[PDB]
Amino acid sequence: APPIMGSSVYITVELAIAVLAILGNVLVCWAVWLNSNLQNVTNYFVVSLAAADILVGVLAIPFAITISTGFCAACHGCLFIACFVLVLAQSSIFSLLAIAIDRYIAIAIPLRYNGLVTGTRAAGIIAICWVLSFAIGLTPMLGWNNCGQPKEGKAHSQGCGEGQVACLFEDVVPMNYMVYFNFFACVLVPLLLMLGVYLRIFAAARRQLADLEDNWETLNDNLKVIEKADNAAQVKDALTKMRAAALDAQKRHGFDILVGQIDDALKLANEGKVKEAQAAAEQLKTTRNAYIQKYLERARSTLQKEVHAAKSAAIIAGLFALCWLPLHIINCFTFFCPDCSHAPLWLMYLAIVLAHTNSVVNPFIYAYRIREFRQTFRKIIRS
Ligand SMILES: CC(C)CCC[C@@H](C)[C@H]1CC[C@H]2[C@@H]3CC=C4C[C@@H](O)CC[C@]4(C)[C@H]3CC[C@]12C
Ligand SMILES: CC(C)CCC[C@@H](C)[C@H]1CC[C@H]2[C@@H]3CC=C4C[C@@H](O)CC[C@]4(C)[C@H]3CC[C@]12C
Ligand SMILES: CC(C)CCC[C@@H](C)[C@H]1CC[C@H]2[C@@H]3CC=C4C[C@@H](O)CC[C@]4(C)[C@H]3CC[C@]12C
Ligand SMILES: CCCCCCCC/C=C\CCCCCCCC(=O)OC[C@H](O)CO
Ligand SMILES: CCCc1cc2c(=O)c(-c3nc(C)cs3)coc2cc1OC(C)=O
Ligand SMILES: CCCCCCCC/C=C\CCCCCCCC(=O)O
Ligand code: NA
Known part of the structure; x- marks a missing residue:
């Protein structure tokens, strides 16, 4: 025709x-x-x-x-x-x-x-x-x-x-330019790099969001340990761990209060006063309910938004690859296979x-x- x-x-x-x-x-x-x-x-x-x-x-x-x-x-x-x-x-x-x-x-x-x-x-x-x-x-x-x-x-x-x-x-x-220089070097390699970056982004996000839950879990489990303790030393153990994990998570008013309260409890536990340290550790729950839990929820919400925005960007990159690949692949056939009929x-x-x-x-x-x-x-x- x-x-x-x-x-x-x-x-x-x-x-x-x-x-x-x-x-x-x-x-x-x-x-x-x-x-x-x-x-x-x-x-x-x-x-x-x-x-x-x-x-x-x-x-x-x-x-x-x-x-x-x-x-x-x-x-x-x-x-x-x-x-x-x-x-x-x-x-x-x-x-x-x-x-x-x-x-x-x-x-x-x-x-x-x-x-x-x-x-x-x-x-x-x-x-x-x-x-x-x-x-x-x-x-x-x-x-x-x-x-x-x-x-x-x-x-x-x-x-x-x-x-x-x-x-x-x-x-x-020239097809050698198209395949080796343009496709392999300038398109393929950067796309692979992009894949690598995305992988690291999703891994970092996943790691940070596990770490947030770990810290939280550590605050709750150590509280229970304090409640079931029999001596000052056990109480001193669980609070020292708690203090480290409060600071890690704070790396404002609410965290100042939290650490301060742990310090209050620790001092009581160092004096051998078990019941007083336990009652003092109970006040920590109030700080957790109205401050710390709100920090956890906002930090998690910020991370999820970052994962959503990263996925949106990745899709765009994936789409570019999907749209361009067929043409590049065809060029590869034309170049690498001279015995093959042209597309x-x-x-x-x-x-x-x-x-x-x-x-x-x-x-x-x-x-x-x-x-x-x-x-x-x-x-x-x-x-
Ligand atoms: C990136 C994703 C969507 C994969 C796309 C693959 C496409 C581009 C592939 C799949 C099958 C391939 C075809 C298979 C057979 C031939 C016959 C040959 O004489 C010319 C090339 C030609 C016609 C190929 C061109 C490229 C082709 C159409
Ligand atoms: C991760 C992926 C998407 C990277 C791109 C893969 C490309 C480079 C691959 C996929 C299929 C491959 C082709 C499959 C078959 C043939 C026919 C052969 O006679 C010459 C090489 C040739 C033409 C290959 C060249 C390279 C090729 C086009
Ligand atoms: C998907 C990614 C990892 C790339 C895969 C590339 C594959 C499909 C490529 C890499 C090396 C290529 C081979 C290299 C050399 C030849 C000799 C030629 O006389 C016939 C095609 C043949 C046998 C190719 C077939 C396609 C091939 C196996
Ligand atoms: C001869 C025929 C071809 C010629 C055709 C014209 C050439 C177009 C080329 C480049 C334009 C690129 C524009 C890029 C715009 C992005 C600018 C931007 O993002 O701004 C950043 C901001 O200012 C930060 O504060
Ligand atoms: C069919 C119209 C003219 C024509 C265009 C191109 C073209 O634009 C490209 C390109 N590759 C890339 C990665 C960007 S642009 C490759 O091969 C072509 C071959 C063509 O004609 C043939 C098949 O003989
Ligand atoms: C923000 C826009 C930047 C654009 C800057 C342009 C940079 C040009 C650099 C390299 C391109 C070289 C192309 C050579 C053209 C040769 C033309 C000729 O045949 O005379
Ligand atoms: Na584009």
Whole structure:
């Protein structure tokens, strides 16, 4: 069949994707700009990512449509049209990695997060990452290309002019660059690193939330030990342990009271007065009920929110991998298996479209998983 028919479907689909990528991502950018509760370091990378997606719609998609035609062009101009999407993908990878790291810093060392991760450091990092993205993505423009070996038969058949080639992705971009440099080195490795960071984030969270329960359990069991003791020494044992575990957990009024009360009881227990120390240890229950238990519930609630936010970020990264992998895998087959028939055109189109679809998905994930974005989206849309 005439190429314009299958080309028509592909183009239409690309155009639809472009519209959706632009709309959703402009909305993300708008939400961050308007809502000061969304203005934080994590979200600056979210905006960088959104910008990359906007550019997929504005530029990468129109470029992809263009290159699908195999139009006559100067080889280097053709390279730009072919590789610009790689710049966008690379930037996305950097943003994704930054978000994972940012969340790891928040969970591992929350006391030092604000002084370490600032808005100014973030903007500089974003700038650097875009520069690096251009370098990586446009590496073929620096000389790793097939412009030195033009397919002159193909160019002459299409009536191309001198110094021009039929602009086709696989004719100008070397597959070794695509597979070894782009896929393995610049996409695969960072994604694996991201996986590693997420694993550490979830482990740190799981460990902290066990530790909170342990401390609590230690306060309750040592209380019971004090109640059932027969001598001062047993009481002194259980309170010394308790004092250590009160401080660990406090590493304000309520904890001052708690430690003070343990000290009261300990002094009584060091004087041999068992019954008085036990009654004194009983007052600890009042401090636990109205102070310590509230600290435990808030600390646990803060951790769960961090796990929820980390899962939301991980999903985004997972989705990027899912959307891009098929295309990369196809490139691997093309490159590693020259005896294998090339993947059919329809599959190529499908793989490309899927890759482009990744630029649509983030706004939905934010809307469904993050309440503050969702509420802001509604307001923007309502207003
Ligand atoms: C990342 C997840 C979703 C897995 C996706 C795997 C996809 C990309 C895999 C699964 C089966 C694969 C195909 C298996 C057989 C062939 C025949 C060969 O002549 C060309 C490549 C081609 C057509 C492969 C292209 C890539 C392929 C379609
Ligand atoms: C953790 C995962 C997602 C990383 C990506 C796995 C990739 C690199 C793997 C998965 C399936 C693999 C392919 C499976 C089969 C063939 C056909 C063979 O004639 C050449 C290698 C080739 C083409 C492999 C290249 C590498 C490959 C594409
Ligand atoms: C999923 C992750 C861990 C990657 C898995 C990669 C696997 C599928 C890759 C790695 C090395 C690859 C093999 C390397 C060499 C050859 C010789 C070639 O004449 C036929 C394909 C064959 C036999 C490949 C089949 C696919 C292969 C086994
Ligand atoms: C030649 C054809 C291609 C050219 C196409 C134009 C080039 C677009 C490139 C980069 C824009 C990147 C924008 C990144 C926006 C993120 C900014 C941000 O997040 O702000 C942080 C905040 O200011 C902290 O206080
Ligand atoms: C079908 C339309 C033109 C075309 C495009 C590309 C393309 O954009 C990529 C890419 N890979 C990545 C990781 C980013 S972009 C790979 O192979 C292609 C092959 C193509 O044409 C073929 C199959 O011969
Ligand atoms: C914030 C946006 C940052 C953009 C900075 C641009 C950095 C450019 C760095 C490397 C890209 C090199 C591409 C070479 C183009 C060759 C063009 C030609 O053929 O003349
Ligand atoms: Na992206």
